[PDB]
Structure 1
Amino acid sequence: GVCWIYYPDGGSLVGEVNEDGEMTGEKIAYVYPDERTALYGKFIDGEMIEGKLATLMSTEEGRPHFELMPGNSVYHFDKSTSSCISTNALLPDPYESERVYVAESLISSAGEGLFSKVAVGPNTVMSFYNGVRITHQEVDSRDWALNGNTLSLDEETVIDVPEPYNHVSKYCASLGHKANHSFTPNCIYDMFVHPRFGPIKCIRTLRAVEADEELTVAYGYDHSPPGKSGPEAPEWYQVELKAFQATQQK
Structure 2
Amino acid sequence: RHGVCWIYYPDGGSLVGEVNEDGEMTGEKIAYVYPDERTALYGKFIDGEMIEGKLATLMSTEEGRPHFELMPGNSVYHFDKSTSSCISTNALLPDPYESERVYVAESLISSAGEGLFSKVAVGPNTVMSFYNGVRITHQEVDSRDWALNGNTLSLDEETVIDVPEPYNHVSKYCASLGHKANHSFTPNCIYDMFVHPRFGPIKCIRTLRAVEADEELTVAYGYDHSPPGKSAPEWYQVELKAFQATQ
Is the TM-score greater than 0.5?
A: yes
d(CA) in 2 for partners of 1:88, 1:226: 29
TM-aligned CA deviation for residue 240 of structure 1: 1.6
Once the two structures are superposed, what CA deviation does each residue of 1:46-93 show, in whole Å capped at 9, x if it has no partner? 000000000000001111000000110200000112331001000000
Residues of 2 paired with 1:225 and 1:160: CA distance? 14
Following superposition, the deviation at residue 19 of structure 1 comes to 1.0
Q: Does the CA contact (< 8 Å) of 2:60 and 2:66 recur in 1?
A: yes
Instruction: Name the counterpart of 1:214.
Output: 216
Counterpart of 1:198 in structure 2 is 200
| Distance change in 2, residues 1:205/1:195 (3 Å) | same
The TM-score, its normalising length taken from structure 1, stands at: 0.94
Contact kept in structure 1, 2:187 and 2:218, CA below 8 Å: yes
Name segments (4+ residues, structure 1) moved above 2 Å.
221-229, 233-236, 243-247
2:131–2:204: 8 Å Cα contact kept in structure 1? yes
Whole-Å separation in 2 of the counterparts to 1:59 and 1:86: 33
Contact 2:141 2:229 in 1 (8 A): no
Kept after mapping to 1: 8 A contact 2:133/2:161: yes
The answer to whether the Cα contact below 8 Å between 2:101 and 2:120 also exists between their aligned partners in 1 is yes
Match for 2:137 among 127, 135, 138?
135
Task: Write the distance in 1 (CA, Å) between the matches of 2:113 and 2:83.
Answer: 27
Query: Secondary structure of 1:239's match?
Result: helix
Is the deviation greater in 236-245 or in 169-178? 236-245
CA contact (8 A) 2:144 2:230 kept: no
Distance 1:97 1:15 in 2: 25
The residue that corresponds to 1:49 in the other structure is: 51
SS at match of 1:236: helix
Tell me the distance in 2 between the aligned counterparts of 1:18 and 1:47. 14
C-alpha contact (below 8 Å) 2:104/2:114 kept by paired residues:
yes
Q: How large is the RMSD of aligned CA atoms in angstroms?
A: 2.2
Candidates 94, 103, 107, aligned match of 1:101: 103
Residue 16 of structure 2: aligned partner: 14
Q: 1:91 aligns with which of 86, 90, 93?
A: 93
Q: Tell me how far 1:156 sits from its aligned partner.
A: 1.1
TM-score (norm 2): 0.95
With over 3 angstroms needed to count, the CA separation of the structure-2 counterparts of 1:224 and 1:78, relative to structure 1, is closer
Q: Among 181, 184, 187, which residue is 2:186 paired with?
A: 184
Deviation (angstroms), 1:226: 14
CA shift at 1:154, angstroms?
Answer: 0.5
**Structure 1 position 221, deviation (Å):** 4.4
Question: For residues 198 and 16 of structure 1, do their structure 2 counterparts lie closer, same or farther at Cα, with a shift above 3 Å needed?
Answer: same
1:20 positional shift: 1.0
Equivalents in 2 of 1:234, 1:12: separation in Å? 40
| TM-aligned CA deviation for residue 225 of structure 1 | 10
Matched residues, percent identical? 100
Q: Distance in 2 between matches of 1:195 and 1:227?
A: 31
For these two proteins, the number of residue pairs brought into alignment is: 245
Deviations 1:103-125 (A, max 9, x none): 00000110000000000000000
8 Å contact from structure 2 (residues 146, 227) kept in 1: no
Structure 2: tracts of 5 or more residues without a match: none
Q: Which residue of 2 aligns with 1:76?
A: 78
Shift of 1:228: 16
Q: Per the alignment, do residues 206 and 19 of structure 1 end up closer, same or farther by CA in structure 2, a change over 3 Å counting?
A: same
Distance of 1:197 and 1:226 partners within structure 2: 25
The CA distance in 2 between the partners of 1:156 and 1:108, in whole Å, is: 34
Task: Give the stretch that moved more between structures: 167-176 or 74-83.
Answer: 74-83
Q: Deviations over 1:102-161 (max 9, x none)?
A: 000000110000000000000000000000011111111100121001101001110000
1:245, CA displacement in angstroms?
A: 3.3
Q: What is the rounded CA distance, in whole Å, between the counterparts of 1:36 and 1:128 in structure 2?
A: 17
Give the match's secondary structure for 2:100: helix
Shift of 1:236: 2.3
Give the match for residue 113 of structure 1.
115
